[PDB]
Symmetry: D2
Subunit: 229 residues, 4 copies
């Protein structure tokens, strides 16, 4: 059990489902294709952009047909088309110039009526706030040493995430949160090996999280295209 892959990925797909547009999907930062496989249950026409040849090859081997793979960094990517749905989940925090990426999404890649599904780890998640109170993390939006090593350049909260989307020219249509998270991953991974927490308890955390977006594991902005000339 990995909390991110086994718990968060499915709830993210749940969170997105009511907002999906008919048509195609673009997955930015598809890596090894773990999230793509869930998206394939919803879309037959998926385009995947990933900078790592190794990751993109693994995906290619594992996933079913109907994926267009684009091996590129986002700033160099030349896409053949515009997209009805764009997924950017746990990628923006790794980008040196996040406004410039969101701006490409707005200006170059969103179809008319298209939607961006923008999801990042939340600074203000309960578990993270507890770690801040414990002094393990200096403050909520801090980037820790491990985090920086893993490539994080920011730790978004709803305030700074909407700022950057807004700065990029996107229209933010909906703000929400995914999964009320009171334990840290290291704790989840241990507890999930036990029968202490049920699947219903997890579903409850998802359900309650919608009522306290600011306290969830990940925060979620639904965005639409704004006119920029």
């Amino acid at each position: 059990y990995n909390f991110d892959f086994d718990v968060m990925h499915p709830f993210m797909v749940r969170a997105f489902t009511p907002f999906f547009r008919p048509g195609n999907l673009l997955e930015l930062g598809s890596f090894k294709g773990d999230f793509t496989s869930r998206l394939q249950e919803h879309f037959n026409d998926i385009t995947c952009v990933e900078a790592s040849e190794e990751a993109i090859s693994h995906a290619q081997g594992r996933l079913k047909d109907g994926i267009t793979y684009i091996h590129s960094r986002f700033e160099d990517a030349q896409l053949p088309r515009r997209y009805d749905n764009i997924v950017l989940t746990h990628v923006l925090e790794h980008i040196d110039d996040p406004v410039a990426l969101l701006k490409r999404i707005n200006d170059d890649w969103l179809a008319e009526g298209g939607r961006l599904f923008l999801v990042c780890p939340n600074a203000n998640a309960v578990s993270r706030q507890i770690a801040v109170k414990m002094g393990i993390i200096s403050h909520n939006s801090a980037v820790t040493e491990a985090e920086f090593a893993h490539g994080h350049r920011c730790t978004y909260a709803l305030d700074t995430l909407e700022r950057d989307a807004s700065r990029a020219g996107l229209q933010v249509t909906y703000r929400s949160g995914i999964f009320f998270k009171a334990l840290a991953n290291f704790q989840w991974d241990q507890i999930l090996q036990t029968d202490i927490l049920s699947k219903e308890y997890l579903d409850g955390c998802y359900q309650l999280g919608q009522q306290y977006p600011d306290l969830c594991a990940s925060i979620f902005l639904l965005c639409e295209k704004g006119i920029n000339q």
Copy 2:
């Protein structure tokens, strides 16, 4: 009027990303004040309203493309099932709310259809301040004036989802509409002044989504169970 001038447009904004293609049923359409806004999104709207006077008034002021059904909910015979059903600021008046919601689930929602269920929120900031002030006993109380207006309940997210769930609906999304720190009587006064802008109101709508429990109205997006 805060409710018609501020709340109605934000309710439509909140629904817009969830609307399904197809038709729409408005339950409790009254004089058509909300229907007019919905007409910007749908050419095929069916309206159910028990007051003949109200429904007559709407018919007078709305554009073509409306099927009007003059009936109590318990008596209503609808000719189709619906991709979108709106029940906004109605359920808190209903003596047996779960029974109405169960008709929606079992009879009126199309497969794939969505119910837009919106009710005034007991935990709204302005109401909580009124409770702290001793004006209202507690958040989910029904005041004498509200009871006189026909309220039988003051929903919060907990009680509203309970009733939807008991009816057999699948509650898909929970949210709030408008971060509300002032009472209607105060808004109606301040709205005559230039102390608050439209951008302020927009800001309250945006912030509201981040604190659903504190909003003016709470919103459950539901699907057929």
Copy 3:
């Protein structure tokens, strides 16, 4: 490990400590003396009112000197004195007429300058809200069957608790919450047998709970005497 006795009792004493007045203390509903023993670290002159002869006898055996024991129901209790500190923790929810008890506290028992420490289980605790979303409990302020069996007649939240204090003539001076609680007791009691959660993590829950009173395990009103004639 019992979450209530091992985790909540000590945090309750922490929560109270900054507000304690010099002088004596009255503990209403002292039962077997589990909480009294912690209070004895702070006060040498404690008066304990308890309706159960069995419980009050157990306390008597176990606790150190400096306790005045009063075996009475609250409505019949004739106390010799007024008190600088009154503790009513997890008792008010068991009372058929809670305003009438709080009114005795205001009118008969609080000394001038005296403080009431009023603590009840919170309807809106995170764990409880999750159980509501799971459909195990109908709504936050519901009283479940097990709860009713244990003697609960109400499940307070900050709104209804301040209402009743106010109705009784008390002045509510401070509102807070004790312990950010995302798991149910049955889960705590299992997890506490493991090394999954540390003492620092628990302290973090206490610390964060103060910032979200409405979501804590127990809610806490600090009250002072109001004039009633």
Copy 4:
């Protein structure tokens, strides 16, 4: 003025149940506006203020029982240690806030003494609405105007407790003062009207305690580590 007329009295209300018997030190007492309120609770108050003009003004308008110390914090030589230390709306101006807090911990607090640390809150409702409106980039930003006024930080509970902790203080209680949904410029306008009562303001103070993160100002009660 919202800050002097509403905020100051609620700050005293918030401190009152935590006050220790003994003496009190007010750091950054300026013209004595807050000191006058504290004088209702303490006969032995020591005031530290760097502006000679300000401190002269206070001396003119305050009652006996005040020791005035005209000094920068870094230079201040205090004759005693203090049972109560007040540092309200000062720390956000200090270039090295942890260094000031460390002097408080190590040199000025009496054993058993309490520090009343209060700063304007980045996550205040009114500020969050301003951020959603695009007026301020984000909650903890410092605006040009605020920077011109000397702010170097916009604290929230997370950053304020971080700095107190780094100084070696023991953070004993965390709270908020005043649930604030309107900006000062809006309060100052609405306060001229009769749209909001004193009971409304009291209600905002009461509700604020239940949502510290959303208050006008945040309040840490600290003790010596």
